[PDB]
Design a binder for this molecule. Structure first.
Ligand SMILES: O=C(O)CCC(=O)C(=O)O
Ligand SMILES: [Fe+2]
Length: 290
């Protein structure tokens, strides 16, 4: 729950912190079980139903997909592995075995994830971090399917969840299953969170033309600078908004399920209107503290 002065210091130094056994095995089973039900009732998205042949379509598919993503801030939607489709856009395996991640409002529209997000343990940790008015800006469930579970390239979360000033966005990453060097565990570059961000993702403003694009670019960095952070089920990994982290493709037989959510210190902070994710009247970023 609450961090000791020591762990608190380590976080400031590294930009991330590993807290083994944060959650119990039963809490992990609860998430695993519920996500299983959510996948079972899933409907393949409109843009993923129709296959394509010409760009006239392949393009319209990528557009519907973009719109699907852009308006998922307050929904529970499915995003699939990019390489699980043939060339005409057909699934190579069942869609329910092709899901890369689910988001982005599990924390608000699902009782199990919501309850876990606002638990006693999470609120105290947040308090021990001195968070004033923390709100939940987004949440995701990441599968890391066996054998092709997509890699997540090097990045900083503030690149997508930009604010003013920086240092106001924090990520909570929870291992539902064991994360190892074999199944796509996280890797961090310790101390890489003190020089701001090099890139930012932005969405088209008022004026239709719905879409995303980047400003700046990820500076290639020394791969040897990454340190792996394999953890056992139930571990929580705190992720500073500017720390550089990544995860390799899952080449093992087991998946590497994880539940994540990001908090923003609303106190004296301004959420960039250019972030793809904007709060809706229905779901303005909810408070963490209960
Ligand atoms: O689970 C992963 O491999 C990446 C998740 C991540 O980058 C995040 O929650 O910030
Ligand atoms: Fe991240």
């Amino acid at each position: 729950a609450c961090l000791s002065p020591s762990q608190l210091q380590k976080f400031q130094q590294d930009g991330f912190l590993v807290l083994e056994g944060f959650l119990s095995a039963e809490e992990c089973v609860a998430m695993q079980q519920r996500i299983g039900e959510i996948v079972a009732e899933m409907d393949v998205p409109l843009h993923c139903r129709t296959e394509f042949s010409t760009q006239e379509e392949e393009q319209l598919r990528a557009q519907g997909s973009t719109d699907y993503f852009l308006s998922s801030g307050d929904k529970i939607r499915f995003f699939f592995e990019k390489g699980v489709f043939d060339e005409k856009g057909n699934f190579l395996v069942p869609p329910e075995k092709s899901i890369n991640k689910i988001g982005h409002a599990l924390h608000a529209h699902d009782p199990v994830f919501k309850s876990i997000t606002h638990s006693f343990k999470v609120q105290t940790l947040a308090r021990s971090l001195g968070l004033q008015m923390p709100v939940v800006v987004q949440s995701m469930y990441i599968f890391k399917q066996p054998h092709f579970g997509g890699e997540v390239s090097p990045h900083q979360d503030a690149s997508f969840l930009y604010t003013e000033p920086l240092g106001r966005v924090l990520g909570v990453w929870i291992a539902v299953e064991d994360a190892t060097l074999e199944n796509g565990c996280l890797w961090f570059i310790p101390g890489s969170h003190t020089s701001g961000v090099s890139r930012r993702m932005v969405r088209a403003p008022v004026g239709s033309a719905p879409g995303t694009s980047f400003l700046g670019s990820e500076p290639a960095r020394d791969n040897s600078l990454f340190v792996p952070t394999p953890v056992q089920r139930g571990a929580l990994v705190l992720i500073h908004g500017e720390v550089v982290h990544k995860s390799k493709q899952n080449l093992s037989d087991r998946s590497r399920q994880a539940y994540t959510f990001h908090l923003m210190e609303a106190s004296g902070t301004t959420w960039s209107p250019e972030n793809w994710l904007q709060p809706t009247a229905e779901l303005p970023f909810p408070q963490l503290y209960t």
